[PDB]
Amino acid sequence: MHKEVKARYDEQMVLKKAALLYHFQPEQVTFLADAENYVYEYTDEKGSSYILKITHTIRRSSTYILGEMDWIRYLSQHGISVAKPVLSARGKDVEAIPDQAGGAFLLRVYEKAPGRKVTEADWNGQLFQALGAYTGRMHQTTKQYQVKDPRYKRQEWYEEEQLKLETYIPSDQTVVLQRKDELMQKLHQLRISKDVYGLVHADLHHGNFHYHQGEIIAFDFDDCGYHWFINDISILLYNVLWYPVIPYEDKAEFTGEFMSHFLKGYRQENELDDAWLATIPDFLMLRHMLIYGLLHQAFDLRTLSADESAMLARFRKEIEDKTPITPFDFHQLTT
Ligand SMILES: Nc1ncnc2c1ncn2[C@@H]1O[C@H](COP(=O)(O)OP(=O)(O)NP(=O)(O)O)[C@@H](O)[C@H]1O
Ligand SMILES: CC(C)C[C@H](NC(=O)[C@@H](O)[C@@H](O)[C@@H](N)CC(N)=O)[C@@H]1Cc2cccc(O)c2C(=O)O1
Ligand SMILES: [Mg+2]
Ligand SMILES: [Mg+2]
16 A cells, blocks of 8 residues: 555545445445555445555546546447446445645546455466457457547556656666666657557456456456557466466476467457567566565565565566576567
8 A cells, every 4th residue: 555545545434435435334345455545345335345546646536536437437338348337326436535734635446346365276277368368359449539628538558657766766776777768768759640559458467356256257448548458468477477376387488388378369359569578577587576566565664574575676686687488488479
């Protein structure tokens, strides 16, 4: 959780106020997680249960959130299974509860996706191919998506707050900042067109979808933005390498297993030219840098535990040394 948001948030106060806008009893709310947003499951007066996501104007505007809502609705209209937004009692997509310190807590609600998180029995090539087909369909569909009013436009990849490392890491980390600057300049040389770049989810991982009768239902579109399609794919790879459901015996071999199955599914649904596969290591490194920023945004750097200092030191060393995120040779996937 963004440290500045944590400094503003009084859960009991906000849930008491939120209870009137969504018709729940605040003592009955179930806390789910507090990673980027504070997320709860609540039950309304009719006995129906929903997912409540709470954040703050420090990190999101209502307008920006409405751009996520627009896109999710478009995907659902075109047959992509996603968790849809639900309205407040006043018919609003996003409710704002004043923060007396300035700004607002921003609240919105979604339908609870059926099914469940993937388990060990699902963690295999069938899932990996299904992820490929689903991602490919999202990309194929997004090619036709138009924003009428630029006020609600989602960000370009390079605008991401957590990549602004110079604002979050101490400035004596000049090597890290050089690595990040060099990499973003490199990525900026890549061709952009409707066939290779568009609005994507940008945080695909197995905490962000349910498997329902063997089908994917995605949620947590909170980071969606304009990216290369290969980056959406690389982010998913980053995430399955980081927290696999079953530990892998070998990182390189697992990378190839995941990617081969994923690509079979993906290419049934959308074109991905072989030339993009060579860029995956660079996008994995960019994600590593983003996570480094996220961790600095979350941690009080004056009160770091031994474990937090060690984690930061590992990322730092990997970034400085240019240690590949995976040892897999991506040229093996080509032709
Ligand atoms: N629509 C939904 N249906 C069912 N469960 C959900 C839904 N949205 C969120 N959850 C659950 O709540 C958790 C947290 O919500 P999520 O939207 O992932 O929050 P976040 O703070 O953006 N997390 P992240 O960005 O992945 O670190 C998810 O991992 C799910 O377990
Ligand atoms: C605390 C945080 C570091 C946790 C991390 N989440 C992410 O890396 C991403 O959600 C963020 O990097 C992303 N929200 C940042 C962004 N700007 O898009 C992790 C990533 C992850 C990978 C695989 C399975 C999972 O369930 C998860 C998960 O739930 O969260
Ligand atoms: Mg999530
Ligand atoms: Mg999220």
